[PDB]
Ligand binder design. Structure first.
Ligand code: NA
Lengths: 251, 31
């Protein structure tokens, strides 16, 4: 996260760190969506050009974390993975369309003041909140600039109009994507960066006062660059698949 | 899940985090 700040305690209880097991290394962010499902970006697990094909056996998640370099006894929970599910039409070769993945935890995780799921949007939440100038919040560890924090970082960013999103980049963008960030003329700065993918773009519904995850940190060109925007996987546009793996798989 | 999107340390204690009002404020600016 570029130009963000230290998260306060319990600010992002849905926050999940995704680790490679051996050698151990923090790969990506993720979010907890029930006691047993963790959401993340597909490119965090599967990226053929780099021969990356991480599976349930290769991966670990940590939940309830605040500090990347301090073991949070009686707070943080380490979880093993039952299975991993990557969206079938995840477009790794081109634009990372449908950059979404689901991971089932071996055993259900116990909720605390520090561990709590985020909500998934319905059509009414998407229709109302996915609008130009509306702010969402993005969280994660990893690069403070193009340099990796020990406290979880948080930044608020406005959704950008699709025409500006489209004209800003030569990448082909789909409806399964939206973009967020300040324009040059706005004074403010801020963007996700290397290490932040998989993390949640959340919004606080003014209707029921719950936080919803509307996006997943996906991609960008540089970090925090004038005239460029971060691009996020569009969660509601992929609910059909999300609901389907959750419904069909184990419970 | 039943109880999603509600933070035990914030919404539940009726407390606002340092920066969440900026979101609210931005949601009413779109008319
Ligand atoms: Na930018």
């Amino acid at each position: 996260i570029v130009a963000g700040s230290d998260a306060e305690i319990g600010m992002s209880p849905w926050q999940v760190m995704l680790f490679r097991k051996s050698p151990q290394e923090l790969l990506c962010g993720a979010s907890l969506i029930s006691d047993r499902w963790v959401l993340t970006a597909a490119h965090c697990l599967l990226y053929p050009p780099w021969d990356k094909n991480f599976t349930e056996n290769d991966l670990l998640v940590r939940i309830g974390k605040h500090s990347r370099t301090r073991y949070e006894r009686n707070i943080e929970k380490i979880s093993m993975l039952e299975k991993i599910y990557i969206h079938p039409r995840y477009n790794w070769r081109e634009n990372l369309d449908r950059d979404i993945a689901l991971m089932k935890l071996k055993k259900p995780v116990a909720f605390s003041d520090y561990i709590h799921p985020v909500c998934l949007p319905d059509r009414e939440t998407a229709a109302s909140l996915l609008q130009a100038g509306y702010k969402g919040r993005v969280t994660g560890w990893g690069n403070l600039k193009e340099g990796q924090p020990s406290v979880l970082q948080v930044v608020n960013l406005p959704i950008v109009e699709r025409p500006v999103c489209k004209d800003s980049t030569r990448i082909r963008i789909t409806d399964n994507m939206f973009c967020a960030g300040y324009k040059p003329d706005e004074g403010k700065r801020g963007d996700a960066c290397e290490g932040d993918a998989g993390g949640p773009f959340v919004m606080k519904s003014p209707f029921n006062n719950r936080w919803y995850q509307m996006g997943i940190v996906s991609w960008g060109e540089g970090c925090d660059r004038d005239g460029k925007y971060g691009f996020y996987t569009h969660v509601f546009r992929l609910k059909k698949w999300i609901q389907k793996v959750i419904d069909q798989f184990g419970e | 899940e039943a109880d999603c999107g509600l933070r035990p340390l914030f919404e539940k204690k009726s407390l606002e985090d340092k920066t969440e009002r900026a979101l609210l404020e931005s949601y009413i600016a779109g008319r």
